[PDB]
Structure formats: C-alpha cells, structure tokens
Amino acid sequence: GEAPNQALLRILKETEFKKIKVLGSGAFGTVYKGLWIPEGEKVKIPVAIKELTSPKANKEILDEAYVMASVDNPHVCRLLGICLTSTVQLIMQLMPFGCLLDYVREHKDNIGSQYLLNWCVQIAKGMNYLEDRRLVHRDLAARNVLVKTPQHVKITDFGRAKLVPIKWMALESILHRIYTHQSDVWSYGVTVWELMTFGSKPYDGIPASEISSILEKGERLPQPPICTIDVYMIMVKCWMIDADSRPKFRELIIEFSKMARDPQRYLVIQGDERMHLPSPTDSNFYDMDDVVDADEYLIP
Ligand SMILES: COC1(CCN)CCN(c2nccc(Nc3cc4c(cn3)nc(C)n4C(C)C)n2)CC1
C-alpha cells in the first residue's frame, strides 16, 4: 500500500553526550544546549537535547521522534537519536540562532530583502519535501522555523505532523478539522507575513474565537509596509477559501526564487544592501577541537 519506512532509530547512551546549559523550559519539559561525543569517534557534535514522567505523554514524544527520525532534507530538522533514561531525551541538531520568529525581532535592523526572500524559498523547499513524504505538518509557523546560520533555516516541530494554533490555520481546519498540504500553504502564508513584519503577532488583539468569523467575512492580514504588491499577492493567494486555488509549495519555491534574484525589486527596506549578519566566513563565528556539525556527521 504505502512504502515501508526504513528509517533507523538510533539509541544513544547518556554517557556519550553532555548538557551544557538550558535553552528553553516549558510544559513539555526542557531543551538543553549540549555536545555529543559518540563512541571513540574523535568528534564533538553540537546538539539540542529535548527531555521530558506520565505514560500517556511519553507516547507523544515518541510520536514526534517517529516523524523526526523519518525526515532527511536540508530544510527540515532531523532526529539524531534518542536516549532512554528515566525521562527520555530527543537529541537534535543545535540550531544556534534559535527560532526565526525571535531572530526577526532581535535583528530587524540588519535583515535585508535577500535574507527574507531566501528564508521564504528555504521554508517552501522544506515544506515541499514534507509533501513528497506525504506528510502534513499542521503547525507551520515562524516559531517553528529554526536558524542554523542566518543564511540557513529549517522547519521543526513534528508534534502534530501526520500522513490548537488558530491564527495560522486554514479555514477548513478551524471549522471542519480538515488538514492537507494546502492547509499547510495557508500557514506558510501566515509565516511569511510574520517574517515580512519582523515578527508581528497575527491578528494581535483579536481572540481566536472571533478569528473564524473574521476570516469568514473576507478579512485577511494586512499588507506589510515592506511588501510590494507582488509579494503580498502571493501571501493572499495562500489565504484563498478554495484550497486548490492556493499556490503549491513547488510554485512558491519558484516565485520566491525569481524574486530572490532581484530582491530590492520585491521588498523595500531602508538601508538594504549595507546590512551585515554573521557568516561562517567571520571571526569568532564558531573546546572547538574536533567539533563537527550534525549535517556533516553521517551514519553509525
Ligand atoms: C521544544 O520542542 C520544539 C518546539 C515544540 N513546540 C521542537 C523541537 N525543537 C528543535 N528541533 C530541532 C532542533 C532543535 N534545536 C535547537 C532548538 C533551540 C535552540 C538551538 N537548537 N535554541 C533555542 C532557543 N531553541 C528552541 C528551544 C526554540 N530544536 C526545539 C523546539
């Protein structure tokens, strides 16, 4: 019927990696910055460690791990392994610059049109990949795109992915709990809005109950100051009522790539082109001995 999922789930020993500090605490548990020093491999791999105990919640993290261990794409966050301790810990790639949402807020004054449009293209590539794998994310948002470097982002959070975040959802989903790749497009639209507004809250003030009807009336998020009509129209097409009228991810990749070739023609930003964000060709950008990025460390 469907193809066998031959992904390898890697079980890692607790003693093979060390927690360094905390990166975030929530209801789910807590995420640590850490290092993974596998076997006798002569490599340190920077990792994020997500740890939880109540039986019906352990199933949800293992569900996330299932999906996260099954993806392999440059614009999606893969699971490196799990560690079975009293708690259960997901080991993931360290994405040193955090979520894109906070990144746009904290670095607004150095974010030019090239970065924004390239981020849009990369998220669309990620999502298109998830579509090839017949996977529906169901929670795409700026908060769930992570920054490996300012020039490289990746989609995460498979805690809702299958084969509630109201202000990012398609209408069909809010009212009928229907979810498709095209419902992910809607959320893509909202995500891009967040980026083009440098991290503004969508429908800030409106309570989620009112949102369903607001959308029913034909209201949509406003045209961000920096957005040419070319870019805004793309957002708006992602918010059509007819799911099939919305763009496909494959087209979103194309449209944003064209615009990324002449960025200042599609986003208008004061001081654009004389802005500097950290690069792997900078000083102090990176024990340091034998550090290897997860993306360059392959197989057991
Ligand atoms: C807590 O789980 C998440 C959100 C679920 N709603 C989903 C999994 N996620 C994740 N996925 C893959 C890699 C990764 N690494 C990662 C996450 C980081 C990070 C560095 N690296 N710095 C910060 C501040 N954070 C997050 C807590 C947002 N983190 C971490 C956040």
XYZ file of C-alpha atoms and ligand atoms in Angstrom:
331
model
C 0.000 0.000 0.000
C 2.439 2.576 1.276
C 6.189 2.140 1.239
C 7.985 0.732 4.273
C 9.561 3.395 6.451
C 13.089 2.027 6.748
C 14.401 4.935 8.811
C 16.892 3.977 11.515
C 16.078 4.990 15.058
C 19.336 5.500 16.858
C 19.555 4.766 20.557
C 22.297 6.774 22.257
C 23.919 6.231 25.634
C 23.530 9.055 28.180
C 27.307 8.979 28.791
C 28.012 9.822 25.151
C 26.829 13.422 25.490
C 26.804 16.280 27.990
C 24.306 19.012 28.762
C 25.946 22.473 28.870
C 23.137 24.915 29.641
C 19.404 25.316 29.236
C 17.974 26.797 26.033
C 14.270 26.732 26.931
C 11.851 25.406 29.558
C 8.134 24.736 29.021
C 5.198 22.426 29.817
C 6.643 19.700 27.528
C 9.862 19.623 29.575
C 13.160 21.321 28.842
C 15.668 21.762 25.968
C 19.414 21.902 26.642
C 22.380 23.021 24.601
C 24.834 20.092 24.609
C 27.621 18.105 22.965
C 27.594 14.594 21.587
C 30.879 12.703 21.701
C 29.961 9.406 20.057
C 31.830 6.163 20.850
C 35.554 6.638 20.115
C 34.927 8.796 17.055
C 37.084 11.905 17.686
C 34.158 14.261 17.031
C 32.112 16.632 19.144
C 28.691 17.387 17.676
C 26.706 20.332 18.963
C 23.211 19.110 19.817
C 19.967 20.275 21.319
C 18.568 17.861 23.909
C 14.805 17.751 24.488
C 13.857 15.825 27.662
C 10.530 15.253 29.437
C 7.011 11.341 33.548
C 3.437 10.227 32.787
C 2.760 7.258 30.357
C 0.201 8.941 28.029
C 2.643 11.831 27.365
C 5.706 9.636 26.646
C 3.755 8.344 23.667
C 3.555 11.871 22.248
C 7.321 12.465 22.355
C 7.905 9.051 20.780
C 5.371 10.076 18.108
C 7.422 13.190 17.435
C 10.590 11.088 17.286
C 8.962 8.696 14.871
C 8.308 11.530 12.408
C 11.504 13.439 13.134
C 13.639 10.322 12.560
C 11.901 9.763 9.257
C 12.842 13.059 7.561
C 16.014 13.864 5.652
C 16.250 17.250 3.931
C 18.442 20.337 4.273
C 15.449 22.447 5.179
C 13.932 20.131 7.762
C 15.170 19.218 11.274
C 16.032 15.514 11.605
C 16.302 13.434 14.805
C 19.900 12.413 15.549
C 18.791 9.865 18.138
C 17.017 9.178 21.423
C 18.336 8.319 24.839
C 16.230 6.039 27.008
C 16.664 7.231 30.559
C 14.031 7.560 33.238
C 12.850 10.648 31.294
C 13.537 10.012 27.544
C 15.520 12.601 25.621
C 15.400 13.572 21.963
C 18.793 14.524 20.584
C 18.566 17.044 17.773
C 20.839 19.344 15.797
C 21.840 22.503 17.654
C 20.373 25.453 15.764
C 22.490 28.131 17.405
C 20.442 31.177 16.439
C 17.105 29.965 17.788
C 13.698 30.294 16.157
C 13.301 32.590 13.171
C 10.479 34.483 14.901
C 12.741 35.815 17.646
C 15.507 36.250 15.133
C 13.499 38.701 13.008
C 12.523 40.675 16.117
C 16.016 40.924 17.546
C 17.815 41.564 14.240
C 15.288 43.680 12.317
C 17.813 46.465 11.683
C 20.217 44.079 9.885
C 17.745 41.937 7.945
C 17.667 42.786 4.261
C 15.491 41.682 1.391
C 17.905 38.932 0.287
C 17.678 37.128 3.617
C 13.894 37.440 3.844
C 13.298 36.112 0.344
C 15.878 33.339 0.725
C 14.209 32.320 4.030
C 10.890 32.155 2.134
C 12.440 29.881 -0.506
C 14.037 27.572 2.060
C 10.816 27.146 4.038
C 8.996 26.340 0.804
C 11.659 23.755 -0.044
C 11.256 22.219 3.379
C 7.500 22.077 3.055
C 7.636 20.735 -0.492
C 9.874 17.948 0.840
C 7.359 17.190 3.566
C 4.756 16.929 0.778
C 6.836 14.440 -1.207
C 6.888 12.384 2.007
C 3.101 12.749 2.113
C 3.495 14.485 5.457
C 1.252 17.277 6.703
C 2.881 19.497 9.306
C -0.264 21.040 10.850
C 1.779 23.577 12.847
C 3.952 25.576 10.437
C 4.799 28.968 11.916
C 7.754 31.297 12.354
C 8.223 29.970 15.895
C 8.798 26.531 14.314
C 11.451 27.544 11.815
C 14.948 27.415 13.272
C 18.142 29.173 12.372
C 21.296 27.082 11.902
C 23.049 30.147 10.467
C 21.441 33.405 9.302
C 21.697 32.038 5.774
C 20.276 28.586 6.604
C 16.921 27.805 8.239
C 14.976 24.594 8.814
C 11.430 23.611 9.686
C 10.872 21.826 13.008
C 8.147 20.671 15.456
C 6.580 17.424 14.212
C 4.456 17.123 17.369
C 1.294 17.441 15.219
C 2.513 16.052 11.905
C 0.505 13.218 10.316
C 0.228 11.453 6.940
C -4.552 24.337 18.541
C -2.794 27.209 16.621
C -5.859 29.125 15.352
C -4.323 32.256 13.854
C -2.167 30.127 11.481
C -4.818 27.680 10.349
C -6.733 27.305 7.146
C -10.485 27.908 7.458
C -11.392 24.311 6.569
C -9.237 23.294 9.539
C -10.702 25.766 12.056
C -14.276 24.686 11.365
C -14.051 21.132 9.987
C -10.711 19.847 11.400
C -9.614 19.165 7.785
C -5.856 19.187 7.131
C -3.989 18.919 3.836
C -0.775 20.121 2.201
C -2.866 23.083 1.008
C -3.820 23.837 4.619
C -0.047 23.992 5.253
C 0.171 26.559 2.438
C -2.193 28.833 4.398
C 0.131 28.575 7.368
C 3.087 29.218 5.094
C 1.307 32.424 4.102
C 0.999 33.475 7.727
C 4.613 32.512 8.418
C 5.827 34.766 5.599
C 3.658 37.541 6.988
C 5.402 37.153 10.340
C 8.778 37.451 8.613
C 7.872 40.451 6.425
C 6.584 42.295 9.505
C 9.680 41.408 11.514
C 7.803 39.160 13.891
C 4.453 40.818 14.466
C 1.656 38.821 16.085
C -1.060 37.997 13.558
C -4.435 39.499 14.438
C -2.908 40.967 17.579
C -5.790 41.509 19.990
C -8.482 39.535 18.186
C -9.361 36.482 20.313
C -9.103 33.134 18.499
C -12.861 32.541 18.768
C -13.561 35.692 16.725
C -10.897 34.703 14.089
C -13.041 32.086 12.363
C -15.716 34.661 11.517
C -13.308 37.498 10.742
C -11.954 35.178 8.045
C -15.500 34.279 7.006
C -16.188 37.972 6.251
C -13.157 38.023 3.870
C -10.786 39.868 6.203
C -7.108 38.891 5.962
C -3.815 40.020 7.433
C -2.669 43.465 6.201
C -0.002 44.283 3.605
C 3.267 44.665 5.493
C 4.997 48.044 4.872
C 7.990 46.471 3.144
C 5.944 44.308 0.770
C 5.437 45.139 -2.803
C 2.105 44.009 -4.143
C 3.988 41.180 -5.879
C 4.909 39.662 -2.538
C 1.639 40.463 -0.746
C -0.416 38.924 -3.546
C 1.480 35.678 -3.014
C 0.547 35.755 0.688
C -3.078 36.456 -0.206
C -3.278 33.553 -2.673
C -2.248 31.286 0.273
C -5.372 32.516 2.068
C -7.994 31.705 -0.568
C -11.079 29.794 0.630
C -10.731 27.260 -2.192
C -7.804 25.019 -1.081
C -6.877 24.091 -4.661
C -6.797 27.760 -5.713
C -3.880 28.345 -3.360
C -0.330 28.007 -4.651
C 1.519 24.748 -4.360
C 4.784 24.616 -2.443
C 6.580 23.792 -5.697
C 5.327 27.104 -7.152
C 6.130 29.046 -4.009
C 9.739 27.873 -4.394
C 9.735 29.185 -7.979
C 8.046 32.504 -7.278
C 10.248 33.435 -4.312
C 13.395 32.244 -6.167
C 12.723 34.634 -9.025
C 12.223 37.444 -6.514
C 15.357 36.442 -4.623
C 17.304 37.199 -7.835
C 16.331 40.866 -7.658
C 15.381 41.297 -4.019
C 15.208 45.096 -3.875
C 12.568 44.988 -6.614
C 10.193 42.987 -4.339
C 10.869 44.188 -0.776
C 11.514 47.795 0.135
C 13.693 48.255 3.196
C 15.553 51.406 4.243
C 19.295 50.717 4.340
C 19.041 47.470 2.410
C 22.336 46.035 0.984
C 24.545 47.746 3.592
C 23.408 45.343 6.321
C 25.618 42.662 7.867
C 24.529 39.405 9.553
C 27.066 36.880 10.997
C 28.565 34.417 8.476
C 30.693 31.213 8.604
C 33.361 33.444 6.971
C 33.602 35.612 10.153
C 35.925 35.575 13.170
C 34.628 34.052 16.421
C 31.642 32.692 14.444
C 32.252 29.221 15.907
C 36.643 23.151 23.143
C 36.359 23.773 19.324
C 38.820 20.922 18.684
C 37.079 18.249 16.591
C 33.711 19.985 16.557
C 31.695 18.806 13.525
C 28.213 19.976 12.609
C 25.499 17.336 12.677
C 24.885 17.912 8.938
C 28.440 16.676 8.277
C 28.354 13.708 10.684
C 26.829 10.689 8.960
C 25.770 7.111 9.950
C 26.715 4.710 12.853
C 10.571 22.024 22.373
O 10.430 21.417 21.080
C 10.458 22.280 19.922
C 9.180 23.129 19.836
C 7.938 22.249 20.056
N 6.722 23.066 20.126
C 10.513 21.354 18.685
C 11.882 20.684 18.553
N 12.883 21.773 18.510
C 14.079 21.544 17.848
N 14.123 20.759 16.781
C 15.251 20.530 16.119
C 16.419 21.147 16.545
C 16.333 21.990 17.656
N 17.482 22.600 18.107
C 17.564 23.809 18.776
C 16.470 24.404 19.392
C 16.686 25.628 20.045
C 17.979 26.210 20.066
C 19.011 25.524 19.438
N 18.774 24.368 18.829
N 17.894 27.382 20.752
C 16.661 27.568 21.130
C 16.261 28.794 21.912
N 15.879 26.503 20.723
C 14.463 26.196 20.891
C 14.101 25.836 22.326
C 13.484 27.089 20.146
N 15.167 22.155 18.278
C 13.003 22.520 19.772
C 11.659 23.254 19.992
